[PDB]
RNA sequence: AAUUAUUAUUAUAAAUAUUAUUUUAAAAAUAUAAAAAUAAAUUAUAAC
């Protein structure tokens, strides 16, 4: 007795890959496009991959004993040398870390910790909430119970994994101001030049539409640093 | 001593020399303990 | 697995009248291979001949020194260089001989003195 | 010369005056790095060419950047971790709320029926045993749902553990809690967050239990007994009184003869002869503490201990018809027993270790002593076997050290 | 037992010179020679330790002060 | 074309009304009693990615691909076809005793691909293969050092194991728990 | 009996049992309060503890409501570039201007002083 | 799979799956002519291309295929729909307030209207077989299901959804009417009626809550 | 390293010891002294990092 | 072909076997050590040891032989 | 070689027996009725007894 | 010498360290290598 084998075509000639022109998958925009298992036809309930590292002990040992590979210890050419990445490299992470050109931020800072913004446009366009937070180098907001998402927390053997729920930093590329009067939209302009006693002759945040200004705030320096057994008290460094 | 980062550009520590100081006295540190 | 060859286990047969291995067990090797390997629980006090562990004392007592140690894990370097896989890095290697280890066959070790 | 085309990893022939190659050992080809480039790029650290650039990073935002909380936020994250007496009292709610909506299943004849689909629960139940730390097979709760006798006995068991939790609280957490709580102290550890040690079982550790017995009833329907014995000997760490202790100490050793692990079900049964002869023995329960410490040993082989507690059984408890046939049970194998009882000949009776050699068994021509020996949970090739000094292995030419010579042998050292 | 220390007593050389010549002339002095490259140690992985050929054969390494008597001869010793 | 940029949302779907870049609701031409009627498209698809995860979990099998098999599939193949049709019971026992590596390769993914049905709830005895297929996978390059200044470049292939466990009940599988009689003469010492 | 009672630890030994309760039914509750006050703004969906004290929100203050600029110039075209190396000097003076950034980019193509713990397996020591 | 779902499945190919014109066309090319007039749309000239095309969904031709046409499948499909399409904050501000949710609410309660009127025209069919071997537990949400699509539950689809909510309304007063003497379900295993008591009450509690409601 | 000498190089130590585009070149009695200034904060501001 | 039952291949340890034919007679006096039996291999009665080929109280004929009478397995 | 293999030339090769007598075989085996694994019938364990008796 | 490859890279100093890489249970051609005959070391030999 014996079994079939029925050798495969596709081992003969491998069919080709349909490559993307201008990277545009063609009808992307025409069909549904569901969990990638299921309408693609592959469904598998768990992929595992080999080349990982958990699984190095599963295939350093399924090959075999005859199959030595040498340099496992030392490369051959020399590997202190500079060297660029691959192209595809870089494009994975120039879009991670943007800010690294010059002058990622927005030219005036008009958004600050407390403000009153709104969302215009992308995931839920149109909630209304206050700044607690803002990442100024990434020109984006941390803004109340909008785009919240829950943080997991992996851990070692101490706690379990923790699961944290916290709402995330949003671009301010697509978040306007709640104007205190119209609650519309409102561009917001650190302006110049005296009007009803102004202490510095000078508003700080004016809104267009009704006019109303508003100040700019200071950021926060730490009240409770200091060591006593390190810190000169401000009179010795006073002591002309 | 040289490294790489976690993206993988070389990096090095600035040099530095290694100067056995004979000293005449046995000197420790105390690690509270 | 490296050559497909099958191993045999041979053996000599009448071993329970014998005087050395009267009563050793073969299932599995020792521990370490320089112990006295392992023994049927019927007969743990049985005296081996007074020399042919003379013959082992003096022998299994050269893996017990820093300098095999400094062989063991040199062993490593050399098989990663000549390429044979699944050998561990000469840095984690767990030393053959230890002192405290050898307490658990130190607990029948009152034989003569 | 120059066969083929004039990339790196291309595939005819070629020659060095033409298209001069640098000598790369192993590169990744242009389908990616199979698993034998990426053995260095877990061990050397990059590919063995030294040409292509380790870009570690991926993997940084994978283990690093997940797991980093600065020290201003460590201390404070465990006062906010749930209170798992809520979801032991919401998951067993819900776990409840699928157990109901599950099909009863078919009953046709001429072919066995397919048992229902399991991913309805699936998700609610990966909550319940996760605070307990019970790991429940879901065959055992997909069986049950499916034979006639326990998918009433088992769903209704969950809605009356479930009424003896949202009525008491959560018996085994207290208990931990009682810890931080009594040798008299004023912190008891928080307010108890359970409801609204010396205790015994309490109701719902009895009723959590009877589930846990009635989860492994479904799993022996199944006969997928070596995780039922995972059940069963898990709920022994809530019995605090010698009571139930003895109850699931003999279901524990009335899954472990079949389980194949026939020396385990000794002591399992033994307990069952420490704890059982408390109550009025005229019940069948009387005699069944002793039955599973002899009847375990009719299993093993070894019938003159059997003779011996099958005797003891006899004495205090009167008439256990188990009992009472193994008394004569043991007159058949007479003298085959006793006449023909070698120390050794243990013809391996059931499938859980006939099984259990399929698995986590040696095998031929790969898992074998001779293909990589294990050695302080690193793999070593066959050669590096500590455990033997054989033919092939290295260490039949360590040598002396140039120390004393401990060898007599002339070309052998 | 034979002990090279215990011998060595027997010969008054020292513990550093009888053992240099039972090991090749490259783990004492300084003549040329090249070890094997999984010895060089490493550096410290996520997972594991650092290693260093100093601390992994610390009795192979070089005994640079015996090599000052016994092979290298002084400048003052020729003034 | 960028994902990212060249479509914000794509629940959305812009036009243009009256040189008005507006952004309307994104729809599909779902069936009906035959009419076509336009169903919400992010609607639609929430059925699909559920209704067929609903359907396929539903399903006793436990489908399992392990990716980056480290074997040459041309190999790989042909001791596979042995595998087609055989019992998980007498698969494990088969790729267990013969001697080639992708057996070995198997029995691991066969294993692995085992415990987790348990985990998914399908019986380890009533499991049968349903299918195995293999498929080429990524290859690395050595180079080959040849005579003559000539040289080539030996490819490592690898390959993948895509493989299904079904479920049939009325699985009844042959006895193999028979010893032999020659055997059986250990009557001797018993 | 006492000399039975010594099997049980021979009997003992192997009791398998006792790896399991070591988490019980609630692995762990939320401990009670560390301190009065925290210093993290408090989590989404997470209920602030009882009796705790977290920070305050200090929401902007309440408001209350010559020549701008000549085009007469185009000189607002960066007469030093963005994107050379700057002074480093927040103080607000150029830093030893080129020569210190080279100081201070050992700095940067060495290691930072933020720096944790690098991933790589190429690592200093 | 070409044609999508023959009977049970919710997705189909039409006007979307285009024509490839760049292939090899696969099957049903009886003869050569077929290629500058394929001439498919001709029923025979149709079944030998369609039938070797895309897998008529079969999980391979003998491979575990999925029971979808029992009631145990199609009823808590259709929960998790609604339970899905309108979460159940809008259940809640229209089952307890009257007052209008918005325009966006009112658009995602009109998305999910005619998201019903779909899985229920393409798993009509089915309902209708399972509904002789249908048991209660599921026959009792075909009426809580349509609350949370907001319609008043009580060929063309309103012609055969009538007559099987008339249908099930019977099977279930039955089953009711069939509980209040109910025999013997189980005399083993469960003879004692626990968690019967409870659950069957508040069936009959929730049965007649929609009654009012319908 | 590199031996061959620069020209940047000293275009920077100029305008670092004094300002060179703008200010005059400090006298060479004083330049070649031990009172030129990157001299002078070396014999009473030593800058060692001993580790 | 929807699906046969499974190619799972019969108890033939029992059958006569080309290979294992050569081992009824097959002198093994160097295999075992304490248990010696009269003749391992040779089922008596049997072709060539194969449990399944019975021909024991079947009529042949082997004046010289012995030959064991029939016994069900 | 003179030409190239069409594919039903390459499976010319897979109908032969010596073929099908080196891949697509499958062993008698069962389990040692002590030793608990599969064997075959002649080969046998390490253990004492699954070498002093021969399952 | 493209290499972890036919290799004592030897200007020098040297003399009793077992000082640490070589699979396979068949048959022919070939390849190395091998008792006997038409005072020496040789043959050819396409012979064990």
Known sequence: ?240 | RRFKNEVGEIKSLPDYKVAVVELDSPVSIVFKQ | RSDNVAMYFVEYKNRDMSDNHKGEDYTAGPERFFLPPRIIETEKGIQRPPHMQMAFDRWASKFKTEEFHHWWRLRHAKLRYWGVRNVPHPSDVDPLWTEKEEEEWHNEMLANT | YQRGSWAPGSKHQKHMSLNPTMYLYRFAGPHGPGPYVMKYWWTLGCFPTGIERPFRLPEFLASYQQQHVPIEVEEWLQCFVKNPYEELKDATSSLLKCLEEVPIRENTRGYRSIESGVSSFAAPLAQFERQLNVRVPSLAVRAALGSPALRERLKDDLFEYNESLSACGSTPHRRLARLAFDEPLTLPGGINNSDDPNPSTSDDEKKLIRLLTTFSEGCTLKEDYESAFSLLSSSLGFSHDDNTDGVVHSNASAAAILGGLYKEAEFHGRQAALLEPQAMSSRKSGGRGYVLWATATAYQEDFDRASRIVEKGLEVFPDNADLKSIQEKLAGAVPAASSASPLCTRMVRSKGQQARALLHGSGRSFDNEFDWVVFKNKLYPSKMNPSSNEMGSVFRRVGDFGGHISTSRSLEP | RFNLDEAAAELQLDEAYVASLYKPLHYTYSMKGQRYPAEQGRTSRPGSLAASRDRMFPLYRRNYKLNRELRVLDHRRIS | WLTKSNLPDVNRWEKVVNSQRVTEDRWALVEEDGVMYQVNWKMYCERLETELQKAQDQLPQYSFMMKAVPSAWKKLDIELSVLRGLSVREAMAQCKLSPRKGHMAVFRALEVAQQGAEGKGLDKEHLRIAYITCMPGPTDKQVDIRSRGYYAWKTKKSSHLLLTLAEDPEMVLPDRTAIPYASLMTMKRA | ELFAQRAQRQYGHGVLRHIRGVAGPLPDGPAPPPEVYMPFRPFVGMPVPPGVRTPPEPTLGKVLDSSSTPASRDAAWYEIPTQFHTHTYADGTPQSRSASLAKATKYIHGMPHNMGQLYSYHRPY | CISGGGRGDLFTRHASAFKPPAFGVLRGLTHSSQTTHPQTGQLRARKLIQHAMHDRTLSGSGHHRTAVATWSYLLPSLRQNVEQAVPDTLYEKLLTDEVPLTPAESRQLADAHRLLRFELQKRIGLLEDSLADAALPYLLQWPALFQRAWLRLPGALVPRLAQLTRHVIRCVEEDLGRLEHGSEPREDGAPRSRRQVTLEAAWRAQWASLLSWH | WNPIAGKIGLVNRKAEEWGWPHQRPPPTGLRRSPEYFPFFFSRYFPDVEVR | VVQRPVRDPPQTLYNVNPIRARFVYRRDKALFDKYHVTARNLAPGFSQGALNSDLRALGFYTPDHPQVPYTPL | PKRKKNPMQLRRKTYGLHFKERYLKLEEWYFCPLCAEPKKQGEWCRREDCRQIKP
């Open chain 1, 1 to 240: 007795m014996y079994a079939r084998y029925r050798t495969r075509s596709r081992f003969y000639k491998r069919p080709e890959k349909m490559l993307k022109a201008y990277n545009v998958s063609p009808n992307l925009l025409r069909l549904p496009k569901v969990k990638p298992g299921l309408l693609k036809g592959i469904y598998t309930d768990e992929k595992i991959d080999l080349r990982d590292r958990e699984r190095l002990e599963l295939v350093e040992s399924i090959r075999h004993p005859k199959e030595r590979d040498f340099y496992q210890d030392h490369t051959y050419h020399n590997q202190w040398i500079a060297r660029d990445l691959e192209s595809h490299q870089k494009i994975q992470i120039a879009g991670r870390y943007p800010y690294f050109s010059p002058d990622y931020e927005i030219k005036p800072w008009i958004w600050y910790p407390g403000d009153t913004v709104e969302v215009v446009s992308g995931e839920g366009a149109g909630q209304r909430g206050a700044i607690i937070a803002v990442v100024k180098y990434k020109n984006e907001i941390l803004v109340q119970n909008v785009n919240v998402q829950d943080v997991v927390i992996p851990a070692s053997e101490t706690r379990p994994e923790q699961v944290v729920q916290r709402e995330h930093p949003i671009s301010v590329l697509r978040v306007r101001h709640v104007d205190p009067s119209t609650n519309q939209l409102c561009h917001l302009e650190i302006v110049k030049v005296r009007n009803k006693e102004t202490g510095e002759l000078e508003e700080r945040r004016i809104s267009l539409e009704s006019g109303a200004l508003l100040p700019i705030p200071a950021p926060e320096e730490t009240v409770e640093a200091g060591d006593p057994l390190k810190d000169t008290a401000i009179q010795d460094a006073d002591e002309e």
